[model samples]
Target: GSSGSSGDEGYWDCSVCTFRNSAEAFKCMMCDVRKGTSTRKPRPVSQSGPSSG
Candidate 1:
């Protein structure tokens, strides 16, 4: 499900932060507020391994 008003063109409302997105869209991990502008930040990759000579 997307977000916002669930209906013909709306997705399911999983969050209660007044946020919603299109059908089959992305889900918000922050505040559980879907649709609404998400403040998602890029995940930092960790480097753990031996360097090649």
Candidate 2:
């Protein structure tokens, strides 16, 4: 069931630091918070915009 990769999916927000991470990523790139371990729900890609930098 884990055959699908998160590449095509949206981004998730880190509960620890509220950082936006890619769907393919397992941890928060900003703070190293692991995914699926946070109490907060992941943010959808539709709500996220392109980065300025």
Candidate 3:
């Protein structure tokens, strides 16, 4: 698995490296111990003109 990298300990603990629906922060796309990164937060668009405009 990706996060199943050994010999350096960059990222481990994927159910003991068995790899089969790993958890504890999933990561198994192409190996290299790097995956999953999402963030999108922006909500502000509601003005009806009434505060000195």
Candidate 4:
């Protein structure tokens, strides 16, 4: 009774195939979708260096 949860969160969801790829896979495992073309992004803090502007 669980539609609970999962990860390997390092993988971004491929908008093209609607598939979850491996952590380092920039392209869809099933297709040629470019990682840059996907609407999704990684979770780690890619924020601008917290520079006090």
Candidate 5:
């Protein structure tokens, strides 16, 4: 199930960075933290797709 302390259903909150994101995304754009994470503190990352690393 999806979870967040968001005010709007169309938006979601970052579990790590506490950023406001859109429901269309599974990962937090502000921190790269995925939704439904059991995070306790902020942890930013830069992981997306298989961009040929």
Candidate 6:
């Protein structure tokens, strides 16, 4: 049963250790993997702001 949100945080699951991280983070807190370095997709809509384009 997957919902739109992960409850307390809409975090992304680490591709290395499967750890959860906030959307604002660009690196994994556990394995030190840079965001998007793995095959996993990052959290959607990480920050709220006007589109750059």
Residue-wise C-alpha lDDT for candidate 6, range 1-53, written one tens digit per residue: 56676446557989888888777777789887887656756657567788786
The alpha-carbon lDDT assigned to residue 33 of candidate 3 equals 48
Q: What is the C-alpha RMSD of each candidate to the true structure, in Å?
A: 9.3, 15.1, 9.7, 9.2, 13.1, 11.7
Per-residue C-alpha lDDT of model 4 across residues 1-53, encoded as one tens digit per residue: 43634744465777878987877676778887777645656666656785776
Q: In candidate 3, what are the lDDT values of residues 1-53, reduced to their tens digit?
A: 25555444444433334444334445763343444546656866776788875
lDDT per residue (tens digit) for residues 1-53 in model 5: 77776665677767689898988786789888767657666777776889786
Report residue 12 deviation for candidate 6 (angstroms): 0.5
Evaluate model 3: give its TM-score. Answer: 0.22
RMSD over all Cα atoms, model 1:
9.3
Better of 1 and 6 by TM-score: 6
lDDT of 3: 0.49
Q: List the residue pairs that clash in candidate 2.
A: none
Give candidate 3's root-mean-square deviation (CA, Å). 9.7
| Model 1 stretches astray by more than 4 angstroms | 1-10, 29-53
Prediction 2 global C-alpha lDDT: 0.76
Residue 30 in candidate 1, Cα distance off native in Å? 8.4
**Cα lDDT over the full model 1:** 0.57
How many clashes (backbone N, Cα, C below 3 Å) per candidate?
A: 3, 0, 0, 0, 0, 0
Cα lDDT tens digits for candidate 1, 1-53: 44565555655555566454446566744355545565867988777887775
Sequence-dependent TM-score of model 5? 0.45
Task: Compute the lDDT of residue 48 as modeled in candidate 2.
Answer: 62
lDDT of 2 by residue, 1-53 (tens): 35786359777878889988988887789998666755756855465666684
On the 0 to 100 scale, the lDDT of residue 12 in model 6 is 91
Residue pairs in steric clash, candidate 4? none
Better of 4 and 5 by lDDT: 5
Clashing pairs in 1: 3-21, 4-20, 20-35
Which parts of model 3 are misplaced by more than 4 Å? 1-21, 45-53
